[PDB]
Design a protein around this nucleic acid. Structure first.
Length: 316
DNA sequence: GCGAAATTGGCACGAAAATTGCAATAAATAG
DNA sequence: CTATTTATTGCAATTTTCGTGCCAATTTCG
């Protein structure tokens, strides 16, 4: 809630920014955004509009994200910049044409489902259709498929053919049983994927765990499908889980060293930091003895993403 | 202090991988 | 029944991302 934001405000903010931020949000709709403009917010606290508009852009950058922003679009625009920069080019493009009105591709609609409109379960898009489902009790681990309920829809030709009939139904069943078999292999491939990914990702779907690395090259060499055909499965197929409904491409990550997802790795560096302490190359030595071989330079980049002004400057 | 080893960041290049365009084959519809 | 264009699998090329290596710039220790 607000208590969560106020406590994080003091960590990275000092001076007027901390004094301003606490008094800065007394203006909001329970949807999370303020009814007042920066024009009015400046005159009340006896501060200029250069200070307020400067700090507000930083305040949304602290979890929980996107608090003060007035527009839904600023919240969505900040979500794409701050969260999904890899696809940020495409995602921002989906918002503009949507405002003027427009249609959306099944992939573009699903890509936008990850965004949230405003701060519990509010989300912009929820799928009417889901291409599979997965769940676990403490009991493990159920995969429904979708097409398991689906069979060839008899077209007008078969129904009207009753208008050498013994041979006619033969041919219709010949074509049908052939396509019914290929559709079984197409859905059987779905079962092969999830049964494989569940082994790694068990923690992620259930609970406390965080995403474990998975490579298409790793998976596509595990079973008959090639990575080229596997890549279009993950993009076009969506799944429901105990925690959320994800693109199926969200379960594939890249690994550094013996692990590791970039997230799990980032937390380790932040944990090791928890005058004397090691600067950079020294900290890579802790992990190499920790079982994970790393590079001296690589810890520097992850030291920049999460706040570490310096391991040296934390000494002074 | 002076010199040598270093912390840190940059420009980037390379490797491992993923996505999209291309072509070949199996298929369906129309003439 | 044959031909054309229709879609899916497999292959190749390109772009995509992420790590790491070295050198330069500022620093610390012997």
């Amino acid at each position: 809630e607000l208590e969560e934001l106020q406590q994080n405000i003091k960590l990275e903010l000092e001076g007027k920014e901390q004094e301003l931020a606490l008094e800065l949000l007394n203006y909001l709709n329970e949807k999370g955004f303020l009814s007042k403009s920066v024009e009015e917010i400046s005159d009340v606290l006896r501060c200029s509009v250069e200070e307020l508009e400067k700090v507000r852009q930083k305040v949304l950058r602290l979890e929980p994200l996107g608090v003060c922003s007035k527009d839904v679009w600023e919240f969505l625009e900040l979500q794409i910049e701050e969260i999904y920069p890899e696809e940020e080019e495409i995602l921002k493009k989906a918002l503009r044409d949507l405002k003027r009105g427009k249609k959306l591709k099944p992939e573009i609609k699903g890509k936008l489902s990850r965004l949230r409109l405003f701060p519990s379960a509010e989300k912009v898009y929820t799928f009417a259709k889901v291409d599979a489902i997965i769940e676990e009790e403490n009991g493990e681990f159920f995969i429904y498929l979708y097409e398991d309920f689906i069979d060839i829809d008899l077209n007008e030709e078969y129904w009207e053919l009753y208008k050498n009939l013994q041979k006619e139904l033969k041919e219709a069943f010949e074509r049908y049983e052939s396509i019914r078999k290929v559709l079984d292999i197409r859905r059987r491939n779905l079962r092969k994927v999830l049964e494989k990914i569940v082994e790694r990702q068990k923690d992620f779907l259930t609970g406390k765990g965080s995403l474990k690395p998975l490579t298409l090259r790793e998976v596509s060499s595990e079973i008959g499908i090639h990575e080229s055909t596997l890549s279009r499965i993950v993009n076009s197929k969506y799944v429901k889980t105990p925690v959320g409904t994800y693109s199926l491409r969200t379960f594939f990550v890249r690994e550094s060293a013996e692990g590791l997802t970039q997230g799990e790795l980032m937390k380790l560096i932040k944990e090791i930091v928890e005058r004397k302490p090691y600067s950079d190359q020294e900290i890579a030595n802790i992990l190499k003895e920790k079982g994970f071989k790393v590079a001296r330079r690589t810890v520097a980049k992850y030291r920049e993403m999460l706040g570490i002004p310096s391991s040296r400057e934390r000494r002074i």
